[PDB]
């Protein structure tokens, strides 16, 4: 009756739709069964992980082994998503993003493989997305104009004026420009290049700016015909859907149209060095130090065995985590607390992306004079690890951490599985051996029980005696990017001089046809699609029970199949907290479980956390009310996880954190604050649109102001200011004040998620813990410019709308997603050239516009104004409304993990009745309701606007007096 039982019914040797069952293994620790199939005619390998989880995932992988630095697989992956023969419309990927019930749809290109995963919950939608992906990847129209627009071409700055000089344009070309500007990408790539100089790892697989114009259309088509062939493919699917439908679809749509080829693409082993080497490279300056110039990164890297031999790789990965993870690691105590640098080097720890894995350690942010000092420190630490070894508790903490990662229930499990086996599988390894994790743990425990100094011989063998050592240093030079610009401009002029006038008219005509291709809106009615009748009308009700306990704390127990885990959450309000101490709350949450408690130092505290729990964290959350725009609850979410047996120890740890935290251990706190300030400064580009919307939305509601205080740019700038203070002690005195105002039971509620079989013991442990512990805003417009040293812009525009429970909210949500799908995508992305841009409506009632890597500023806001004029014009059909409803119901019905079912009632206090009411309000949205709501809220002068800009200097913005400059 179940799916996994029938998946265990697959017998060896059965022929199923051209596939042959080669191997069947039950993985009881993961509640999934691995099955290995091979297609007889093509030789494509198939691995299916059948597990009773409705979020089904498919992925297909192609082995791309480049032999030059042209970047052909990255551009080929970009171009293959631009159109196919059966679906000639442009970009099936984004078009199916609004015609499906998927939760994830993307693609990745590593150094030596390309990966196309998606996940969805509807079997007909699975058929839909699998058919579009098969036809897009295996049968694209390989039009020459797609290769000139996305890749490389010579083009005038204005394509209609034939007298201006020629320059390079292209998506991948400027992606590699932006990759080359990234110092970490130079460091990682050159590290791989110098350590592996023999074969494909010695080149820039994403594309070398000096080697990119050597790529021809003929080479692109030949590479596609040779490498995007199903014999060079590995298909992977995960979940509970019947396999027969998948196999039948694969055979009837794709595999029959090809014939067998044999890829001559196996990567040979890197030849071992006889002697260690040193290299010096250069990168681009940053704003850290001029005269001192501490922006010097150094690393020491060691070659490790292959990922094929699974056991030795698993052992060395655990060893690298013992060496680098946490303040109890040798390298942390030797390097981080040495005060010579700022953070670990990039690619620190075990890096298994290449064929031969490699270990790396070092620091960034050091003075260049200390390079030999660092190298001697690394050698001396290897000597000390050989002489002293590891304590048994840290080994137990690591084995408990890896086991807790095995049993944990996430919502994106299949994506983690395909990313975890892609690298090993790419080099012809057996992916099933990475799945049999229990056996590796058992053999690990036995191999430690037989030889107590085994790991000392491992560290000696692979670190002190490893002759394939590389010490690589980087120092910045003032004359670097102009040298690169000189040589690139020289390649440009040498390529331009040999061109005839007939070639220039060919460029002129190709440019005008490319502009027409980029301008004309095309039709996508050839794609198959679902309808609103396929969306479930009602959701299954989630059962809860709230128990007031000891003597007024409400405690929510949710019986769920959590697989032997207890997930504890607590939310304590901050309404009594003084307003001056508000901005230091996130810092408190980030350091509370890292400073020591009672008789435990920070080393022992971190050891106890890794030994008993799977991680204990605190993060501030602002939960808006659903019936008043000017009502919100502010508080801190304490979250933890443990196995069922370590629960009383976990609650003993929690009681010790709540009753005697050590806010006096100052040195590790200084280390952590400089590390988090560095981490937040490093993370600005990837979440720039989030920071732009959050600053843009500060001025509409008090909840926005509190979100600005907890997670806006003010928090990063303040954290940097605190990290620049030389005396941290008066800042450290503020933490007992947060302990005294927040750690009590006056305004508290808690949650427990566990198995029902475990529930009474959890109720006992929690009641013991609870008995053991102590006891009118008017929005106003704001325009803001953050001067950032970025090459692209990030702008945000916010409009104030209705909250969740208003019937107009569902219609506004449909309208926002509609505008994103049918206006903003074409206007900002295709015309403008930005990587991301759209419209969103948040749960509190903020209609927010955003831009991600946008080259323009004024034209983007003008496109926003034309989008609102488009919405008032009403120029959309009922099928577009069905498409927007499909996308919204694809978003709200995203799968929730057992650890958060139901979390939404615990946080926001929305019952299933409110969700059913809003779901039927999304059902009732009509065309005239969309025009009415567009003239009621989005129109000009009806609500207050807010503006914010992240980006470089722009003089035209600076001469506007209505902007405030930051």
UniProtKB/Swiss-Prot annotation:
Impact after mutating residue 155 to D/Q: No effect on metalloendopeptidase activity towards an amyloid-beta peptide derivative
Main location group: mitochondrion
Recorded family membership: Belongs to the peptidase M16 family. PreP subfamily.
Disulfide bonds: 89-526
Effect of residue 527 to E: Decreased metalloendopeptidase activity without effect on protein stability
Consequence of changing residue 169 to N/R: No effect on metalloendopeptidase activity towards an amyloid-beta peptide derivative
Assembly mode: Monomer and homodimer; homodimerization is induced by binding of the substrate.
Record annotation: effect of changing residue 528 to G: Decreased metalloendopeptidase activity without effect on protein stability
UniProt-listed GO biological process terms: protein processing; protein targeting to mitochondrion; proteolysis
Role of this protein: Metalloendopeptidase of the mitochondrial matrix that functions in peptide cleavage and degradation rather than in protein processing. Has an ATP-independent activity. Specifically cleaves peptides in the range of 5 to 65 residues. Shows a preference for cleavage after small polar residues and before basic residues, but without any positional preference. Degrades the transit peptides of mitochondrial proteins after their cleavage. Also degrades other unstructured peptides.
Documented effect of changing residue 860 to M: In SCAR30; strongly decreased metalloendopeptidase activity towards amyloid-beta protein 40 and amyloid-beta protein 42
Consequence of substituting residue 153 to D/E: Loss of metalloendopeptidase activity towards an amyloid-beta peptide derivative
UniProt key word Nuclease: no
GO molecular function terms listed in the Swiss-Prot or TrEMBL record: enzyme activator activity; metalloendopeptidase activity; metallopeptidase activity; zinc ion binding
Post-translational modification: A disulfide bond locks the enzyme in the closed conformation preventing substrate entry into the catalytic chamber.
Cellular component aspect of the GO annotation: mitochondrial matrix; mitochondrion
This protein's name: Presequence protease, mitochondrial
Any Pfam family: Peptidase_M16_C
pH-dependent activity: Optimum pH is 7.7.
Enzyme Commission code(s) on record: 3.4.24.-
UniProt-listed InterPro entries: Metalloenz_LuxS/M16 (IPR011249), Pept_M16_N (IPR011765), Peptidase_M16_C (IPR007863), Peptidase_M16C_assoc (IPR013578), PreP_C (IPR055130)
Upper classification of the organism: Eukaryota, Metazoa, Chordata, Craniata, Vertebrata
Organism annotation: Homo sapiens (Human)
Effect in UniProt of substituting residue 155 to R/K/N: Decreased metalloendopeptidase activity towards an amyloid-beta peptide derivative
């Amino acid at each position: 009756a179940a799916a996994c039982e029938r998946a265990l019914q697959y017998k060896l040797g059965d022929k199923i739709h051209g596939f042959t069952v080669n191997q069947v293994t039950s993985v009881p620790e993961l509640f999934l069964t691995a099955v290995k199939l091979t297609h007889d005619d093509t030789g494509a390998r198939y691995l299916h992980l059948a597990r009773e989880d409705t979020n089904n995932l498919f992925s297909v992988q192609f082995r791309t082994t480049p032999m030059d630095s042209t970047g052909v697989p990255h551009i080929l992956e970009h171009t293959v998503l631009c159109g196919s023969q059966k679906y000639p419309c442009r970009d099936p990927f984004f078009k199916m993003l609004n015609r499906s019930l998927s939760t994830f749809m993307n693609a990745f290109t590593a150094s030596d493989y390309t990966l196309y995963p998606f996940s969805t919950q509807n079997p007909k939608d699975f058929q839909n997305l699998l058919s579009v992906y098969l036809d897009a990847t295996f049968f694209p129209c390989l039009r020459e104009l797609d290769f000139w627009q996305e890749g490389w071409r010579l083009e005038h700055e204005n394509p209609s004026d034939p007298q201006t000089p020629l320059v390079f344009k292209g998506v991948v070309f400027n992606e590699m420009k932006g990759a080359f500007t990234d110092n970490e990408r130079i460091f990682s790539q050159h590290l791989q290049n110098r350590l592996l100089p023999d074969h494909t790892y010695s080149v820039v697989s994403g594309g070398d700016p000096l080697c990119i114009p050597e790529l021809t259309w003929e080479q692109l088509k030949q590479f596609h015909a040779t490498h995007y062939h199903p014999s060079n493919a590995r298909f992977f699917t995960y979940g509970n859907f019947p396999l027969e439908q998948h196999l039948k679809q694969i055979h009837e749509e794709a595999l029959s149209k090809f014939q067998k080829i044999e890829p001559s693409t196996v990567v040979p082993a890197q030849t071992p060095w006889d002697k260690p080497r040193e290299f010096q490279i250069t990168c681009g300056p940053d704003s850290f130090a001029t005269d001192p110039s501490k922006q010097t990164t150094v690393s020491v890297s060691f070659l490790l065995p292959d990922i094929t031999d699974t056991f030795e790789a698993f052992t060395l990965s655990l060893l690298s985590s013992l060496l680098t993870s946490g303040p109890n690691s040798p390298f942390y105590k030797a390097l981080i607390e040495s005060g010579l640098g700022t953070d670990f080097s990039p690619d620190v720890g075990y890096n298994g992306y290449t064929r031969e894995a490699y270990f790396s350690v070092g620091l960034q942010g050091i003075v260049e004079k200390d390079i030999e000092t660092v190298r001697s420190l690394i050698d001396r630490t290897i000597d000390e690890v050989v002489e002293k070894g590891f304590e048994d508790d840290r080994i137990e903490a690591l084995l408990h951490k890896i086991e807790i990662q095995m049993k944990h229930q996430s919502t994106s499990f299949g994506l983690m599985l395909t990313s975890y086996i892609a690298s090993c599988w790419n080099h012809d390894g057996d992916p099933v051996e990475l799945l049999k994790l229990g056996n590796q743990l058992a053999k690990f425990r036995q191999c430690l029980q037989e030889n107590p100094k085994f790991l000392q011989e491992k560290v000696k063998q692979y670190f002190k005696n490893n002759q394939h050592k590389l010490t690589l240093s980087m120092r910045p030079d003032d004359k670097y990017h102009e040298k690169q610009a000189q040589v690139e401009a020289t390649k440009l002029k040498q390529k331009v001089e040999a061109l005839s006038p007939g070639d220039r008219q060919q460029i002129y005509e190709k440019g005008l046809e490319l502009r027409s291709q980029q301008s004309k809106p095309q039709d996508a009615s050839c794609l198959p699609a679902l309808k609103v009748s396929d969306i479930e009308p009602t959701i299954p009700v989630t059962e809860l029970d709230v128990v007031l306990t000891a003597g007024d704390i409400p405690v929510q127990y949710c019986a769920q199949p959590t697989n032997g885990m207890v997930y504890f959450r607590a939310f304590s309000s901050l309404n009594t907290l003084p307003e001056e101490l508000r901005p230091y709350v996130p810092l408190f949450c980030s350091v509370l479980t890292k400073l020591g408690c009672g008789l435990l130092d920070y080393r022992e505290q971190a050891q106890q956390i890794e030994l008993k729990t799977g991680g204990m964290s605190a993060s501030p959350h602002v939960l808006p009310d659903d019936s008043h725009m000017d009502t919100y609850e502010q508080g801190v979410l304490f979250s933890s996880l443990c196995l069922d047996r370590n629960l009383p120890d976990m609650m003993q740890l929690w009681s010790e954190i709540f009753n005697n935290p050590c806010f006096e251990e100052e040195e590790h706190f200084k280390v952590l604050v400089k590390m988090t300030a560095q981490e937040l400064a490093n993370g600005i580009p990837d979440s720039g649109h989030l920071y732009a919307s959050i600053r843009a939305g500060r001025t509409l509601t008090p909840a926005g102001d509190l979100q600005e205080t907890f997670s806006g740019m003010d928090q990063v700038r303040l954290m940097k200011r605190i990290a620049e203070m030389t005396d941290i002690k008066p800042i450290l005195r503020k933490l007992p004040r947060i302990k005294k105002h927040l750690l009590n039971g006056d305004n508290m509620r808690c949650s427990v998620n566990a198995t029902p079989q475990q529930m009474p013991q959890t109720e006992k442990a929690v009641e013991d813990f609870l008995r053991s512990i102590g006891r009118t805003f008017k929005p106003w417009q704001m325009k803001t410019h953050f001067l950032m040293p970025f090459p692209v812009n990030y702008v945000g525009e916010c409009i104030r709308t209705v909250p969740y429970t208003d019937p107009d909210h569902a219609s506004l949500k449909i309208l926002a997603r509609l505008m994103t799908a049918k206006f903003l995508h074409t206007e900002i992305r295709e015309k403008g050239g930005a990587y991301g841009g759209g419209a969103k409506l948040s749960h509190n009632g903020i209609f927010t516009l955003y831009s991600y890597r946008d080259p323009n500023t004024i034209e983007t806001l003008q496109s926003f104004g034309k989008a609102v004029d488009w919405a008032k014009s009403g120029k959309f059909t009922q099928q577009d409304i069905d498409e927007a409803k499909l996308s919204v119901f694809s978003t709200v019905d995203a799968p929730v993990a057992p650890s958060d079912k139901g979390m939404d009632h615990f946080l926001y206090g929305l019952s299933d009745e409110m969700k059913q009411a809003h779901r039927e309000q999304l059902f009732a949205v009509s065309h005239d309701k969309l025009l009415a709501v567009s003239d009621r809220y989005l129109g000009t002068g009806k609500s207050t606007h807010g503006l914010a800009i992240l980006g470089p200097e722009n003089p035209k913005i600076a001469k506007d007096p209505s902007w405030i400059i930051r």
